[PDB]
Amino acid sequence: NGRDSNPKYLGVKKFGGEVVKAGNILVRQRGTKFKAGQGVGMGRDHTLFALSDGKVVFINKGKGARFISIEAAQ
Amino acid sequence: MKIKLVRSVIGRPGNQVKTVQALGLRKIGDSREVSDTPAVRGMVKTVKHLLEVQE
Amino acid sequence: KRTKFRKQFRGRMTGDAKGGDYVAFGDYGLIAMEPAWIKSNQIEACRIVMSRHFRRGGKIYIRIFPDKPVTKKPAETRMGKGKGAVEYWVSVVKPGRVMFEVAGVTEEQAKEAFRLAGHKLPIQTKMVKREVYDEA
RNA sequence: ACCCCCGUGCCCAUAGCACUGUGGAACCACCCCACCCCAUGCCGAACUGGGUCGUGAAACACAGCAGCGCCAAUGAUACUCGGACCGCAGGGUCCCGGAAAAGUCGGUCAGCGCGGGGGU
RNA sequence: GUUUGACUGGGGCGGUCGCCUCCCAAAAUGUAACGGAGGCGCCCAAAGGUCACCUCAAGACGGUUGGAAAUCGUCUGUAGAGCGCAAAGGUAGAAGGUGGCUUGACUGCGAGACUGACACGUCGAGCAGGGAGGAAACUCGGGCUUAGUGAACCGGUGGUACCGUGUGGAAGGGCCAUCGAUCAACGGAUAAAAGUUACCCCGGGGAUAACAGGCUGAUCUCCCCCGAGAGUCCAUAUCGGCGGGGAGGUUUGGCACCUCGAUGUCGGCUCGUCGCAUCCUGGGGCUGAAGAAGGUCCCAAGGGUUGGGCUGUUCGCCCAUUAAAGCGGCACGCGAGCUGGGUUCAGAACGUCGUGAGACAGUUCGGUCUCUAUCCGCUACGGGCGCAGGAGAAUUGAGGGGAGUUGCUCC
RNA sequence: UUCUCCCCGAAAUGUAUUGAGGUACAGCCUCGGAUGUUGACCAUGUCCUGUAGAGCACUCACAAGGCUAAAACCUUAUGAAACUCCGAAGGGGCACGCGUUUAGUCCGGGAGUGAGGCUGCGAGAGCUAACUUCCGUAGCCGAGAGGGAAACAACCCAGACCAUCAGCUAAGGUCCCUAAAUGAUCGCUCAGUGGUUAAGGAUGUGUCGUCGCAUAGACAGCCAGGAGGUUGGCUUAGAAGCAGCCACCCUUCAAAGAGUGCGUAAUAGCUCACUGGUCGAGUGACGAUGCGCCGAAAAUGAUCGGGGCU
Ligand SMILES: [Mg+2]
Ligand SMILES: [Mg+2]
Ligand SMILES: [Mg+2]
Ligand SMILES: [Mg+2]
Ligand SMILES: [Mg+2]
Ligand SMILES: [Mg+2]
Ligand SMILES: [Mg+2]
Ligand SMILES: [Mg+2]
Ligand SMILES: [Mg+2]
Ligand SMILES: [Mg+2]
Ligand SMILES: [Mg+2]
Ligand SMILES: [Mg+2]
Ligand SMILES: [Mg+2]
Ligand SMILES: [Mg+2]
Ligand SMILES: [Mg+2]
Ligand SMILES: [Mg+2]
Ligand SMILES: [Mg+2]
Ligand SMILES: [Mg+2]
Ligand SMILES: [Mg+2]
Ligand SMILES: [Mg+2]
Ligand SMILES: [Mg+2]
Ligand SMILES: [Mg+2]
Ligand SMILES: [Mg+2]
Ligand SMILES: [Mg+2]
Ligand SMILES: [Mg+2]
Ligand SMILES: [Mg+2]
Ligand SMILES: [Mg+2]
Ligand SMILES: [Mg+2]
Ligand SMILES: [Mg+2]
Ligand SMILES: [Mg+2]
Ligand SMILES: [Mg+2]
Ligand SMILES: [Mg+2]
Ligand SMILES: [Mg+2]
Ligand SMILES: [Mg+2]
Ligand SMILES: [Mg+2]
Ligand SMILES: [Mg+2]
Ligand SMILES: [Mg+2]
Ligand SMILES: [Mg+2]
Ligand SMILES: [Mg+2]
Ligand SMILES: [Mg+2]
Ligand SMILES: [Mg+2]
Ligand SMILES: [Mg+2]
Ligand SMILES: [Mg+2]
Ligand SMILES: [Mg+2]
Ligand SMILES: [Mg+2]
Ligand SMILES: [Mg+2]
Ligand SMILES: [Mg+2]
Ligand SMILES: [Mg+2]
Ligand SMILES: [Mg+2]
Ligand SMILES: [Mg+2]
Ligand SMILES: [Mg+2]
Ligand SMILES: [Mg+2]
Ligand SMILES: [Mg+2]
Ligand SMILES: [Mg+2]
Ligand SMILES: [Mg+2]
Ligand SMILES: [Mg+2]
Ligand SMILES: [Mg+2]
Ligand SMILES: [Mg+2]
Ligand SMILES: [Mg+2]
Ligand SMILES: [Mg+2]
Ligand SMILES: [Mg+2]
Ligand SMILES: [Mg+2]
Ligand SMILES: [Mg+2]
Ligand SMILES: [Mg+2]
Ligand SMILES: [Mg+2]
Ligand SMILES: [Mg+2]
Ligand SMILES: [Mg+2]
Ligand SMILES: [Mg+2]
Ligand SMILES: [Mg+2]
Ligand SMILES: [Mg+2]
Ligand SMILES: [Mg+2]
Ligand SMILES: [Mg+2]
Ligand SMILES: [Mg+2]
Ligand SMILES: [Mg+2]
Ligand SMILES: [Mg+2]
Ligand SMILES: [Mg+2]
Ligand SMILES: [Mg+2]
Ligand SMILES: [Mg+2]
Ligand SMILES: [Mg+2]
Ligand SMILES: [Mg+2]
Ligand SMILES: [Mg+2]
Ligand SMILES: [Mg+2]
Ligand SMILES: [Mg+2]
Ligand SMILES: [Mg+2]
Ligand SMILES: [Mg+2]
Ligand SMILES: [Mg+2]
Ligand SMILES: [Mg+2]
Ligand SMILES: [Mg+2]
Ligand SMILES: [Mg+2]
Ligand SMILES: [Mg+2]
Ligand SMILES: [Mg+2]
Ligand SMILES: [Mg+2]
Ligand SMILES: [Mg+2]
Ligand SMILES: [Mg+2]
């Protein structure tokens, strides 16, 4: 009635204004606190990862619906 | 922008210590002449209780 | 007194109260000055005193309520299994919080009734009539 | 160039709801019919296929309006990085910057593109 | 011959040991407790691929069985539902509810990243072979995610044709699939294992219990505030509900700080000495104090505080007295001072428990208490020097010790 | 577990363990090589977060009313580790240096450490106990001498290369023991408070406010007075101002209230409120604070370190 618990690191991993290489993981989350943006892909656990290299950037609108996205260099 | 140490590093937190070390002061009674550019103003503000800022 | 409710046990610390600094109901009000827990029978003794002095008449409101469980380990054991399942319910009380307030009783009799009730509370406390008030 | 309609985006409640008024032969809408393309775990109600008329009834479009939502200051306070203290303790104070939540004043019933249709 | 886990506010009994979710966790991640709550060791050939369509809970009014909730109809209706199991995030342009065809619940790979001491674990664009659904863009290498798990060794089965001891074979082995793990103590000592010791031994520990001391003061003891009532009447002569605040440190305890290269433990005896919260005596107030005899509170620690029966007892009950038969501290004072009755060694017995060896909350008869005091402290007794000459006597008293109780009768 | 001086200098954490006072890996130390400012601090830009606070919009809890077949629903009103319409200060990543400093990283040889301790802040367990226990965070001890804190690892100041019968300062101090003003000014407490807690209690005292009564002559003193209904109704055996229950109405006045306290089972009796004379100026009740008072009893001899200080 006490002994139990468990430890699974989660969170944003690549924050806005950072230069991700493509295939980088940018957020680990359990649901859709972030929705995959333009240039972003989301795997089974709703991880968001770079589709192509660029500047990571965040779009915030109402915390029901914000999105991570890539603005490529060049 | 004259400065000197007038209180020891010892027994003071880490940022205060490394900041004293950045400003160029390594002994009480050291003095120095520092430019007024924002980051140096921020350093000499961060540890202003250790320093007798001249004016 | 005891609530009919939810999770058995809790924690504890403090900061000045917000949820009732002003006397809405009634005329006069006794009011806490210190941050103790108040809990159950302490209040109920306040209630039974004032109801003796006043009843057949007056309106008695108890704006405070034994929300918070508090625990006692058994008897005499070492720091052992878990915490102790029961013991008494309390109400945290911060200064400016209003515990009591009478209605339909003359100023002086409310003085004497607040005096009796406050002679059995862990905190010292001060009474007041309601100044001008806002918050509606 | 002015007007309005049909689509369609950016922005997605300061742009939403309620009460109200205005539109029909431009446009949209209801509407008529349906054995079949097609289709409802029963019903062409909805998808669907052929078309007037009629009617803007409902819908939709536009306009009014601040009852409701939504936005939301200033003053101050809570709390607090840092600095220095008190109380035996619960707990409290001071100087220095940072600074809410709520609530009051007020603000709104949007704003900005692309096209195509039809008016003048 | 051996085995007979670990954690553990001493050990044992109990509980726990891997994995998921939330709080603790101090707005990054991480973070302990025998902290607070709850779940997993599965499930689904469709609850999966894809492709098409539908939208929930709840309420109100109205209606056949009904009669709060069934079924049907209108209205309101960011979700108050649903999502196979827990909870959390997420979710209505669905991940929810239904139908169509289907297996991508793929083979060979893997840019680049999350996470871990390692070994593990997670996500993943994109390339080829070949498919599935869609008209198409395109989506598919199991499931809305997060638990449904097990290294290695040793082996069962099916492919493959690497090895194969002179040569060609075959036996045997290897490579690719795959079967065998409450190895749950869940990073898993052997393929294979329980007890007991009071007959006990060794190495260690004050890293850790029993005594005592310490810290604390829940429990214990004691005192104060209020004043409901009792006291015929009157709260406070006495008593004082329900509640509040303190003191002490003598109880049981918590904690584990010095002592495990030893700080001897119950009770008695002996010897004392201290506190005062005073049993007696002494002085006071008040009284529901006429006197007498009392009640209770205040001052007061000089002295005093009996002898027996029972029991190891401390206590406590009793006998017969008393002015009184006080309560505590002093390592629960005092074993290099005595007992040794009590409990903690070996024998033996009963009751009980254990198949046993043995055990105890026990009960019972028996059972080695170490001639020489170095220092300090104490009681007594001398020697030396000093006390401005050397001698014999008499002495002041700075200061210090002892003593200090009480009845009875009579006027 | 033995000879010297010189340079640097840790660990008592993490995960695993028939593991727990052992050991492996990592972490932190040192040495040599390589790079060669990538390190540190502080600033601006940008992004992330749900704590402090707050709030009831959901879940649970919950206080007084309204409507009502109680549920919902309206006004008023609260609590929250496992609630959140909101939500800071701070904190983390990245870039840049717009600016100061001096480390950082990679490679290879040698390690030790894996028993920690205290305090402040943030929590849990515990009594909001412990020189308590388990985490987080800062600093000291550990391995830190020196000055202060009587004495005292940890608290305050400050990091000891060697010499000096030179100087300046920190915390902390300036009557004597003791270096240094028996200093200066405006105050406060007469308790040795200072130099030992609280509920509670009190005309201690100094400072401020808020209220009333008044010199057309008030507060306390003194003389005179103290109503008739009515033994107000119930009440009880009796309760007549005064055991307890319903009110507090009229006549007169300058006027004495079905009325405050003592008395007696009940009465009576004595005084109270309000009204006069003579005084004769302040007086009375609340409330905030400064410093003091009581509340305040343990054991071998006392004391603030001592003398002693108003
Ligand atoms: Mg400091
Ligand atoms: Mg507080
Ligand atoms: Mg505060
Ligand atoms: Mg409020
Ligand atoms: Mg349109
Ligand atoms: Mg309309
Ligand atoms: Mg026309
Ligand atoms: Mg039709
Ligand atoms: Mg119309
Ligand atoms: Mg402001
Ligand atoms: Mg600052
Ligand atoms: Mg601070
Ligand atoms: Mg401020
Ligand atoms: Mg606001
Ligand atoms: Mg409009
Ligand atoms: Mg146009
Ligand atoms: Mg052997
Ligand atoms: Mg063990
Ligand atoms: Mg259990
Ligand atoms: Mg965190
Ligand atoms: Mg944090
Ligand atoms: Mg830890
Ligand atoms: Mg807990
Ligand atoms: Mg779907
Ligand atoms: Mg096809
Ligand atoms: Mg793929
Ligand atoms: Mg084979
Ligand atoms: Mg051969
Ligand atoms: Mg073969
Ligand atoms: Mg293990
Ligand atoms: Mg094995
Ligand atoms: Mg075994
Ligand atoms: Mg025997
Ligand atoms: Mg033998
Ligand atoms: Mg031994
Ligand atoms: Mg030893
Ligand atoms: Mg110890
Ligand atoms: Mg141990
Ligand atoms: Mg012993
Ligand atoms: Mg004991
Ligand atoms: Mg002990
Ligand atoms: Mg000892
Ligand atoms: Mg008590
Ligand atoms: Mg003890
Ligand atoms: Mg310890
Ligand atoms: Mg010894
Ligand atoms: Mg013993
Ligand atoms: Mg006495
Ligand atoms: Mg006497
Ligand atoms: Mg007498
Ligand atoms: Mg006797
Ligand atoms: Mg005999
Ligand atoms: Mg004695
Ligand atoms: Mg004892
Ligand atoms: Mg003894
Ligand atoms: Mg002996
Ligand atoms: Mg014996
Ligand atoms: Mg038997
Ligand atoms: Mg014999
Ligand atoms: Mg014997
Ligand atoms: Mg001899
Ligand atoms: Mg002579
Ligand atoms: Mg003498
Ligand atoms: Mg002498
Ligand atoms: Mg060094
Ligand atoms: Mg592990
Ligand atoms: Mg270890
Ligand atoms: Mg190592
Ligand atoms: Mg090097
Ligand atoms: Mg770098
Ligand atoms: Mg740099
Ligand atoms: Mg809070
Ligand atoms: Mg708002
Ligand atoms: Mg530079
Ligand atoms: Mg190495
Ligand atoms: Mg070497
Ligand atoms: Mg350790
Ligand atoms: Mg630690
Ligand atoms: Mg607790
Ligand atoms: Mg400790
Ligand atoms: Mg050490
Ligand atoms: Mg030192
Ligand atoms: Mg150090
Ligand atoms: Mg020192
Ligand atoms: Mg000293
Ligand atoms: Mg001291
Ligand atoms: Mg110490
Ligand atoms: Mg030392
Ligand atoms: Mg000087
Ligand atoms: Mg000074
Ligand atoms: Mg001097
Ligand atoms: Mg002076
Ligand atoms: Mg007081
Ligand atoms: Mg007087």
* Residue C15 CB lies within 7 Å of the nucleic strand F: yes
Find the C116 Cα to ligand 56 centroid distance in Å: 66
CA–C1' span, C112 to F228, in Å?
A: 38
In chain A, where are the structural domains located?
10-74
Domain C18-136 belongs in CATH node 3.40.50.11540: no
Method: X-ray
Count of residues making up chain A: 74
* C60 and C109 Cβ atoms separated by less than 8 Å: no
- Residue C102 to residue C114: CA distance in whole angstroms: 9
Give A67 Cα–ligand 5 centroid separation in angstroms: 28
Read out DSSP for C72-107? ---TT--S-SS--S-EEEE-B--TT-B-EEEESS-H
Q: What is the resolution of this structure in A?
A: 3.3
**A13 within 8 A of A21, measured Cβ to Cβ:** no
Question: Do the Cβ atoms of C88 and C40 come closer than 8 Å?
Answer: yes
- Residue B54 Cα to ligand 82 midpoint, Å, equals 33
C119 — phi, psi (to 5°)?
A: -75, 0
